[PDB]
RNA sequence: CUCGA
């Protein structure tokens, strides 16, 4: 889906499979968190479906020894003295000592400030213990979390429930057309993108000789040239657009191991899983009712949440009993207008926009004469069209697909291309759609705050700030204090300060809230980028102080108050909203759960040959399953005819379904339901 | 004693349950009459002894289920349980 | 109504669209009409609207727990690709909007549409068939919006001032339209107490009596009220002739009104009234200033002081474990009660420190959503967290999520969070399995007769008499007494009967027997209904969803089964306890019972427990043998000691529970009779659901027990 | 035996069904669902099912 | 720009002094633009007349009760505030109301100076006790909208004169909602619905036409700036 | 500064604790 | 308390931002007037934009041109920033040819008579030695925002690449009112409208268009039934 | 197998 999803997949630890355990034999004890998983397997990142606990992600600093156990690094404390010597301990090796938590107050020499410090002991015991007892201590605070988990800013303010969803949904982000790095970061976004392998890093130091949208050439110091080719508009495994773009320009000195070009979900080398959106935390006329989301149409007009998707379509020409399937533009009983987008071979031409039902590859298969309907042989005689022994088996666009044809690949047995035995030609057509953000597309943040788009208001309808800038997204307030994910509120505050910038009062010394902050944080410019590392990062004392010194806009006015709220105007009436509303910038991701894929409907269509019931799934153009539980609802209502109707004429009644379709197009009444063919099979199976 | 019923709510489900013994009985009264009205529209051009036409005045492109449900409300039909 | 995408409707109604495309001569033949729909010619969108006109559709969301999991709607063509659902049916579907999908089914035949129009329409199913209380009511933003304007604020601008000095009374408006014009300019606040002359709202039945009384209040007559402008705007949504309510609209208050509206006023009024509450709730929820900011998460003022007092008491229990005076198994139990007591003192420190203007409090205290335990976890402290074993960790998470948990604090929290989600998949599996078992055992239970005429019934504890002299309402009235029908005239101390036999127990008709002094009523029950196969309607009673007598032919068994299996998602007793009862298993408690009434002969020792009973009439001594690990239930004794722990010499009755636990339902039958064992199972199952906040009427539990005792065994052929 | 074979223990019910040679009167909710009959409940019972509707003698002239 | 056709105004008359107006079909999403503006123009920008202050003989420093009548002081002010009145004179006018003896006072028992008209002579004002007498002086002025009594504190003479809320505006209650209509296979076109309840001084038709004139004049100030093209039909 | 090892953009971190070992 | 006719006087801040004060409005009237102008400004002000483009070497958005640093998708996104005005009100064609080392800017476009480019310094693409960029740009005139017209709906053949058209020339609109709430006979609201455009038209021209739009609309209430 | 409610 995105680089993070790929990097996480390689670091997965799966209990299932051969030699492990069966899913039906995995009890509630294998799946839950064990105290030996600290710094080895993440306690947060795991699916919430039937594979919960059975699939984990390796912790960040963790590694595997040649035996098979997972080691995690620690700083060896000799006698209450922190040393820079680091040693990796296995799981059982860790229990034979006691280790101090990473956030221990430590002297500049290395001595612990308190005699009693929070220390982990064997069997998952936490207690204070003398400073002369600490054998090791954690490397980093975030030592226990996974890479994806470590990307959630203010993670220590979100409950584990929504934190799990936060990391799991980051892997579901969709690569947008253009990508922006988040204002509020954790620092992990850089290494996560580089180590994932979807960017282009310089192997050796040198200068940029030539740069194009196609490739980047680097002239090394010794004299050799290495050229990196960009992956442009390539279909990913899950239909997302993997597209790399050069970053450097002509004649730029680039160091070794530096990002010279970045791919999907990357901006200047950092994980850009979404966009920075101006968010207001308020209910709005019920359009954001329990977890629904309201969006400004600006995100549509400016392609802010627009993403490219590519589908692969395929068909082949085989040898049949009565001849050979041939791919040809000549298709029986088709106008020159539908075939107008096809070349002389029967293939759609590059660049042609194709809706659903349009022909992509024109293939005809010879059908025998003894396979003809009585009406079809009469209909063939009353049209005088002889020599049409072939029928239409062309490759058409599925329902719900549409886009520009971007590439064609043809494989022919005639041209040394190795096809499976019995095939004479193979064609693959790549179709790319440009998907703007739509009503019902699923957005989400980094704190497990998910929701579908409930309404995309015009830019004027949106509640706007004092200087006319409308907000981009309206998140409901009711869905905040239940989930225990205040991190989105804290990110919104720090997000605004990043958008505006700040200046702390330097006169009369450094204030008492900014004493712990680094000197680099005392002054910030608008649209500055910041890191809130997991279990470290911004404290509420410093965040409260930043809102008090936010930089004014171009007009010189401070829009947000020290509380973090601002005064909004109802764009639909004009009256200002009666109370200040929390307003800031939040990083929102477009998840790969779009209505363009998830909408489906069927009047009639294919039926499973054996049971004579409609097929399943959208891809097979199937119908919905009125299951066992759903039939109890009908009977509870007493809706007898609806129940009989569902299970007969609308399902597996071979003659009833055809006579109902005729009764509708005739305007007649619905006929009487017959006997299900599935019940006929049951009897023939009992026999 | 209520606001004007809009859309499918009209005729009010409360008044329709007065000319009938139960919710389940009103379903058959309306459906069986709806089939009569539907057969009149398809046997008006051909055949004699065609079923009795819509008793009330129908709206333009009104569904026979809606026509039958209005005349049950207007006490123009009978029944036999 | 419901909004479904245009592209969905075209394919759903494809044969109907093809029919009209050839009628209006947009297409030559039906063959080319099909090509027009597949190619989406611009003529189909105008035709498609004519087709879906008043043609209902079915909406459904898995899982289909109860029958309201499928409801009928009138489709309205909307652009986009998402289904538009009404915000009030979200409770019935249990549907949030975080990526949920629903299925649409199109009824074809005339009978199928009629069943959707009348039986399955969402407007005709506002009440829950399981409990009778409404479901399509203001729930989240709507209840907060209504809770906003119906609040009385003292210092609010435009308030009423008594006449003092040279100026007369300030803040008395001739018309609500004037108070609107006052609030428009900015003099009056919608939450300020004022005096308004009202002319289109019935006064309370209390004050309507003193003003008119002889004749009902008339639309046009005037009267004074001491409300807020918002409370007047709220009462406007309610229909004319409804008594004005000057209270603050909590969710409980709104649910009480809608329940009263469903009982008295007709269906179409209830459906249209709640739409007004929906539109009005959303409007004022938008303008209620409800927001979450870091500033609004107030921290306890004595947070440091409170924990240090318990860190001291924990350090003393830790030192009392250093000298070995406390067992290790006891130190954990000792420290747990230190932090359980500590988390209460922190939670109390939040309630008083938090103002009532703070939105976090306004959300919870209005019935909108959330617990204060969540708010306490949010601002005060998380508390004791559970490890995957089950017992609480001897060390609590002292930090709050506003403060920020430490690395170790966060790690120990995840243990309970992951196992919380883990068993939620298993607990739903055993729930859905128990549900489908209940379906098949009662699938064929139908109402086939109007009245079976049996005067048999059962006695229901309507209320409890008191030594003080005032009757106390029994807690089991809602689930066991309401919606019943009588099988014996209620007689007070006077000769007059208060309610006749065969009258549905409405809300006032219960206060009629309450104010009459009678505390017991004999009601018709589905248990005593003597019918060959099904059950008669008179013994069933009021259909909770319809609010009236159950119709003949309604599959009350499937409704009862779904009513019990839908809340089964939330249990701990617990869910296996519910399975022990419905499967008639010899329980884990295995409590003994008194086979014969008489005198208690307690022969207790320490090696074991043996107890005999001398029969109060004839017979011989009956000897038992029980383990000393149990304890005797505090039995109500004949000499007025309700908490009389069973010692020898007490006079216990036949079929009286001896020791605590769960009496074997198999043995309860072979002692007191089939009538009494059915009563045991009903209120024993009910105690597992009541001890969780779920109100299922005893009627539904009784429909299942009737199927368990329909068979007898053969002793002699 | 048809309502039981679709609940639990399909073989255990079908074995005892052919031995005792049980015949099933198709009168039940679970049974009629399988064969496609109207369920004997709600609008399916004979009281509401077999119902005749006719217009009152008052009729229009056109 | 481009042409935007078919916007029409229809009126449904509930009562003689309360009608419902529908403006259809406004292209999306204008219904809100000219929605709240039309309401505020009706409620605040139509010239009307109403009582500014009153003075009751026998009431000086009390303001609690008037002797000889059942109604107290504030109940007199209410029925006087709802007195509908119209004036052709811009300057403030003083009207006297007097009636003695047991009986009932009405707004017809008032004597109106030339130019002023009382439109509800049957409106009850006070019930006269036995041997009861009531003298009261009313001050009527022209204005627009609703002005509180507190601002009229200076208008009252230091001799038992009390100021009152002035309901100058002829319209009493206006609400509006916006729905959706489909002109050309687009479901977003807005339909605006206006509900205007007015006094019997003017009908809802003229109240709306008055608001339209004052708004065209208002936006005419912007129109005068350049006279460029704009979506018009 | 945060991650001053590859030549990346300068993200400013609210870090009170030094990182002894790089990822 | 009687009427004084309101007056509107323009204040200039820069060449594409102006404040407008309107007074004296009735109390509470100021906020609603500012909104009704803002909504008409942000939506219904006529302007010109580029409908479709046509690059010679390409046949669709999802490709690259040899020698240019940006793919065609990124080039089109840069072209969405173009501000342009057209006198023709009918489709008209702009051209752009550039080659050799250098940067192609909006000034490198040669507009036909009637059409003019209002920010000739906007970056479009970077070209190296081997890079040659030849682009046609069709510019129409409408209002608001119209998405890219489909090739199946238009008569456009394969080479044409439709683009979204952002027609509105207004950039940012706000307002503030100052209420005179001193308890006295005289209360009034003063509206301060703030309008910023994109150099296609001046702020007063935009407010004039929104004025003539609303004057026409509110005239529907003045006509009797 | 992987995920969505
Ligand atoms: Mg959900
Ligand atoms: Zn009975």
XYZ file of N, CA, C and O (backbone and C1' of nucleotides) and ligand atoms in Angstrom, chain C residues 61 94-100, chain H residues 5, ligand 1:
40
model
N -27.383 -4.281 8.069
C -25.987 -4.259 8.487
C -25.694 -5.498 9.312
O -26.375 -5.759 10.309
N -26.769 -0.722 15.365
C -25.478 -0.651 16.053
C -24.394 -0.161 15.094
O -23.246 -0.608 15.132
N -24.767 0.778 14.227
C -23.930 1.211 13.117
C -23.256 2.534 13.452
O -23.933 3.552 13.630
N -21.929 2.518 13.537
C -21.151 3.743 13.553
C -20.713 4.069 12.127
O -20.973 3.318 11.185
N -20.044 5.205 11.959
C -19.644 5.624 10.622
C -18.129 5.715 10.507
O -17.585 6.776 10.186
N -17.444 4.604 10.761
C -15.993 4.515 10.657
C -15.589 3.488 9.607
O -14.625 2.741 9.778
N -16.330 3.440 8.504
C -16.070 2.492 7.443
C -17.067 1.360 7.321
O -16.778 0.381 6.624
N -18.224 1.459 7.969
C -19.225 0.406 7.888
C -19.848 0.348 6.500
O -19.930 1.351 5.785
P -12.482 -1.230 10.535
O -14.012 -1.641 10.688
C -15.040 -0.842 10.120
C -16.407 -1.387 10.447
C -16.671 -1.690 11.914
O -17.002 -0.538 12.666
C -17.407 -3.502 10.586
Mg -18.405 0.890 12.820
